[PDB]
Amino acid sequence: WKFNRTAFLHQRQEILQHVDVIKNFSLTKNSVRIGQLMHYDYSSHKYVFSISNNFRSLLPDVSPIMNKHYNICAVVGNSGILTGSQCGQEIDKSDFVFRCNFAPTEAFQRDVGRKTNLTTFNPSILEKYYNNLLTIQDRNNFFLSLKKLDGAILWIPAFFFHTSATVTRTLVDFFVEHRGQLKVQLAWPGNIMQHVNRYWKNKHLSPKRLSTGILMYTLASAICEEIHLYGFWPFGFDPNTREDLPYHYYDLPAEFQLLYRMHGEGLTKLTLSHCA
Amino acid sequence: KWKFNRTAFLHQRQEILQHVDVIKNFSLTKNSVRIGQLMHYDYSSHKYVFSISNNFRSLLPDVSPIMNKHYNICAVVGNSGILTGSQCGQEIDKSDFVFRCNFAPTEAFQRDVGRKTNLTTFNPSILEKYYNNLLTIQDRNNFFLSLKKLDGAILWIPAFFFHTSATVTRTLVDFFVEHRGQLKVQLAWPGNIMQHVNRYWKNKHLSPKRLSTGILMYTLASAICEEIHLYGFWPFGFDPNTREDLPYHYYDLPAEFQLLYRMHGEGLTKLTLSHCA
Numbered sequence: 345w346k347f348n349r350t351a352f353l354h355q356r357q358e359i360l361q362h363v364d365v366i367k368n369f370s371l372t373k374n375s376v377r378i379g380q381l382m383h384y385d386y387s388s389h390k391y392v393f394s395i396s397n398n399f400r401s402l403l404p405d406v407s408p409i410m411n412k413h414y415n416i417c418a419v420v421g422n423s424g425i426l427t428g429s430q431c432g433q434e435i436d437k438s439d440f441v442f443r444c445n446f447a448p449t450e451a452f453q454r455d456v457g458r459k460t461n462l463t464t465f466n467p468s469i470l471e472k473y474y475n476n477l478l479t480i481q482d483r484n485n486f487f488l489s490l491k492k493l494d495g496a497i498l499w500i501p502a503f504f505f506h507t508s509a510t511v512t513r514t515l516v517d518f519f520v521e522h523r524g525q526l527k528v529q530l531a532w533p534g535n536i537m538q539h540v541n542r543y544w545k546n547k548h549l550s551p552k553r554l555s556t557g558i559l560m561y562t563l564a565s566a567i568c569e570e571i572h573l574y575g576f577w578p579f580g581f582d583p584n585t586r587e588d589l590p591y592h593y594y595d596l597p598a599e600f601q602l603l604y605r606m607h608g609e610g611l612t613k614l615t616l617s618h619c620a
Numbered sequence: 621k622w623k624f625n626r627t628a629f630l631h632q633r634q635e636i637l638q639h640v641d642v643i644k645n646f647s648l649t650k651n652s653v654r655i656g657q658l659m660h661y662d663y664s665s666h667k668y669v670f671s672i673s674n675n676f677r678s679l680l681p682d683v684s685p686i687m688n689k690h691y692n693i694c695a696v697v698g699n700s701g702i703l704t705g706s707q708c709g710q711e712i713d714k715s716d717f718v719f720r721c722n723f724a725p726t727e728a729f730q731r732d733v734g735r736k737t738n739l740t741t742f743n744p745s746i747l748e749k750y751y752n753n754l755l756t757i758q759d760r761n762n763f764f765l766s767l768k769k770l771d772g773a774i775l776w777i778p779a780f781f782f783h784t785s786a787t788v789t790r791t792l793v794d795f796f797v798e799h800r801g802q803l804k805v806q807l808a809w810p811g812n813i814m815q816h817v818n819r820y821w822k823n824k825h826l827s828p829k830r831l832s833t834g835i836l837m838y839t840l841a842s843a844i845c846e847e848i849h850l851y852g853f854w855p856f857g858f859d860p861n862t863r864e865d866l867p868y869h870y871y872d873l874p875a876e877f878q879l880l881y882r883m884h885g886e887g888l889t890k891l892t893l894s895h896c897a
């Protein structure tokens with residue numbers, strides 16, 4: 345695989361033509377009004393969410409990625425293809441590492457690495473893994489997870505699904521209460537998937553719901569000189585051994601075809617094999 | 621026929637108020653909680669908590685809404701189907717002060733239940749069941765319109781009875797902060813009070829792991845009413861005079877009712893189980 349820097353910078357210019365990535369990355373204090381009604385990107389337009397004093401107080405003053413430039417970025421998905429890959433060292437060598445859905449690293453360091461600079465957080469994760477922060481034990485566990493992220497950006501898409509509404513109110517309340525006690529940088533994208541989906545429409549990727557991986561590649565494109573993908577592999581067998589794989593390392597086929605095409609054209613390095 | 625025994629009632633009142641500080645228990649107040657304080661739920665495992673936000677606290681009253689209030693005749697109106705066809709409306713509205721349970725509707729049922737409302741209770745689960753969690757403009761407007769019709773009534777919201785109220789409390793709180801100043805409704809939010817209430821009534825032979833909103837209502841009423849009349853308390857699905865079937869609720873626990881019937885017997889209160897004059 346050889347990196348084609350000119351093709352990549354060209355892809356970047358095309359992306360930024362269709363998506364104002366720095367702006368789209370997160371709402372800012374002055375980009376919303378108290379009382380404003382947000383709609384949900386992937387839900388009926390009739391669903392709304394009112395912006396409280398408190399939600400707004402949790403937004404950044406300027407985009408967390410304004411004037412940031414990193415040389416090598418790793419974007420790490422959650423496929424089982426990472427299990428036994430020993431990609432840990434190669435991933436941690438990167439200048440900036442994106443991860444998906446609050447994925448765990450402590451017990452998987454050798455394969456996925458421990459360095460984290462941005463991680464995505466669907467608010468449904470409170471419900472599934474932290475019991476809606478209903479007990480002291482859960483509130484402490486959540487606090488502790490967030491402390492381990494140090495100064496990483498936590499990218500919370502609250503306005504994708506209307507089913508994230510009630511949990512958004514629990515998160516917001518938790519973050520206000522613990523204001524000043526965490527170095528984690530919150531980022532809250534608004535209604536951005538129409539604009540993101542337009543760029544990728546012209547590259548014949550269609551689907552109902554664009555994946556977090558393609559979305560990550562899109563952000564990464566604005567701030568990384570060179571993107572390497574790890575853990576993107578939708579199928580439940582290994583591509584070299586053909587032995588079975590766990591669906592996720594810690595236990596869509598249209599998207600992956602596209603990334604493999606891009607790997608072919610030297611835009612990015614998709615890694616599907618053991619590292620060391 | 622029923623005769624009011626005023627001396628027996630005033631005796632019951634003095635006994636209640638000796639064991640329950642009703643005026644205090646009625647609602648938390650701004651200065652009675654701290655931002656960050658963890659509330660527990662009276663009828664749930666002690667492990668469940670709710671943190672008091674800036675916003676929750678801003679919605680509490682500065683003093684108890686029933687401090688130094690005294691009414692002559694109080695009606696306490698439950699929701700049993702026994703009210704259907706009863707024409708109790710006029711007798712209920714004649715009262716000086718009317719308590720109602722669980723945001724019960726009156727517009728379509730005036731002749732039987734009355735229209736006058738001075739306090740109504742509100743389990744926050746009602747947002748999920750009838751207002752779709754305030755998720756749409758239509759639901760937010762419907763809720764706003766219901767609250768506007770209560771004018772200056774107290775809305776008594778027991779947020780800390782069941783842990784399953786937690787998420788919907790956060791939706792209410794947010795709704796009320798957003799609409800601050802636009803409603804004359806007087807919010808009241810009782811804290812952890814059922815230990816103290818249930819202990820007075822333990823010695824009167826009523827046990828349960830959940831006390832009923834009606835007994836709770838009688839307890840509050842006792843602190844501010846000279847004479848209490850109960851309407852719509854009747855747990856069974858048949859009429860006591862005709863024996864024909866009844867809807868469970870007029871708008872569609874047996875231990876508690878036994879107790880209220882005993883009290884009716886002793887002239888403390890008038891339980892009404894029949895058509896009104």
Ligand SMILES: *[C@@H]1O[C@H](CO)[C@@H](O[C@@H]2O[C@H](CO)[C@@H](O[C@@H]3O[C@H](CO[C@H]4O[C@H](CO)[C@@H](O)[C@H](O)[C@@H]4O)[C@@H](O)[C@H](O)[C@@H]3O)[C@H](O)[C@H]2NC(C)=O)[C@H](O)[C@H]1NC(C)=O
Pocket residue numbers: 639640641642644645646810811812813816
């Ligand atoms: C609802 O009304 C209640 C009165 O019916 C309020 O209860 C009072 O609340 C205060 C503040 O929490 C308590 O003050 C404490 O007093 C005890 C004294 O020991 C007592 O132990 C039990 C009480 O259950 C009993 O044996 C005697 O009352 C004893 O005197 C101290 O340990 C504390 O430091 C503190 O000063 C009152 O004791 C308490 N009264 C009763 C009868 O329990 C209650 O706070 C109200 N709740 C709300 C939300 O308004």
Ligand SMILES: *[C@@H]1O[C@H](CO[C@@H]2O[C@@H](C)[C@@H](O)[C@@H](O)[C@@H]2O)[C@@H](O[C@@H]2O[C@H](CO)[C@@H](O[C@@H]3O[C@H](CO)[C@@H](O)[C@H](O)[C@@H]3O)[C@H](O)[C@H]2NC(C)=O)[C@H](O)[C@H]1NC(C)=O
Pocket residue numbers: 415416
């Ligand atoms: C940004 O990163 C690029 C590319 O870095 C390369 O690939 C990464 C994924 C990692 O594996 C890196 O370890 C690896 O360097 C950097 O460009 C590279 O710079 C180095 C010099 O530091 C170049 O190597 C030299 O080449 C000359 C002539 O061929 C030799 O005489 C030298 O001894 C030495 O080997 C290399 O050509 C160049 N690589 C590419 C693909 O262009 C870049 O330095 C870095 N920038 C910053 C500011 O960090």
Ligand SMILES: *[C@@H]1O[C@H](CO)[C@@H](O[C@@H]2O[C@H](CO)[C@@H](O)[C@H](O)[C@H]2NC(C)=O)[C@H](O)[C@H]1NC(C)=O
Pocket residue numbers: 362363364365367368369533534535536539
């Ligand atoms: C995401 O960026 C898009 C694209 O730049 C923004 O869409 C523009 O919004 C402006 C308002 O400032 C419109 O007048 C432009 O016509 C839009 N341009 C395009 C190409 O659609 C959008 O505001 C951004 N969304 C967020 C949440 O930041």
Ligand SMILES: *[C@@H]1O[C@H](CO)[C@@H](O[C@@H]2O[C@H](CO)[C@@H](O)[C@H](O)[C@H]2NC(C)=O)[C@H](O)[C@H]1NC(C)=O
Pocket residue numbers: 439440441458459460461494
């Ligand atoms: C990207 O994230 C990692 C956190 O995982 C940052 O690396 C840490 O930097 C601190 C502060 O100097 C060190 O004390 C830690 O030992 C580093 N941890 C690891 C795991 O390497 C890194 O600095 C961040 N980089 C950028 C550009 O934000």
Ligand SMILES: *[C@@H]1O[C@H](CO)[C@@H](O[C@@H]2O[C@H](CO)[C@@H](O)[C@H](O)[C@H]2NC(C)=O)[C@H](O)[C@H]1NC(C)=O
Pocket residue numbers: 625627628
């Ligand atoms: C009203 O109720 C009171 C209290 O229950 C009655 O007064 C008691 O009457 C009994 C006789 O059955 C006496 O032995 C008690 O000493 C009285 N109690 C007190 C505290 O004085 C009263 O009789 C009732 N009135 C009516 C009309 O039934």
Ligand SMILES: *[C@@H]1O[C@H](CO)[C@@H](O[C@@H]2O[C@H](CO)[C@@H](O)[C@H](O)[C@H]2NC(C)=O)[C@H](O)[C@H]1NC(C)=O
Pocket residue numbers: 692693
């Ligand atoms: C409290 O209300 C009662 C009930 O209406 C009042 O006493 C009654 O007064 C009416 C008419 O004024 C009479 O027809 C009843 O026969 C009375 N009943 C009894 C048992 O005395 C009482 O005066 C009211 N007190 C107030 C307004 O202070």
Ligand SMILES: *[C@@H]1O[C@H](CO)[C@@H](O[C@@H]2O[C@H](CO)[C@@H](O)[C@H](O)[C@H]2NC(C)=O)[C@H](O)[C@H]1NC(C)=O
Pocket residue numbers: 716717718735736737738771
């Ligand atoms: C109890 O509630 C009713 C409202 O349900 C109050 O009665 C209203 O009072 C206003 C202003 O005094 C009148 O203009 C309305 O016509 C009355 N409505 C009804 C239905 O009677 C009553 O004042 C309240 N009682 C209190 C606070 O003691």
Ligand SMILES: *[C@@H]1O[C@H](CO)[C@@H](O)[C@H](O)[C@H]1NC(C)=O
Pocket residue numbers: 348350351609
């Ligand atoms: C990528 O670089 C090659 C040289 O490797 C160049 O000729 C080509 O035009 C670039 N872009 C595309 C789209 O192939």
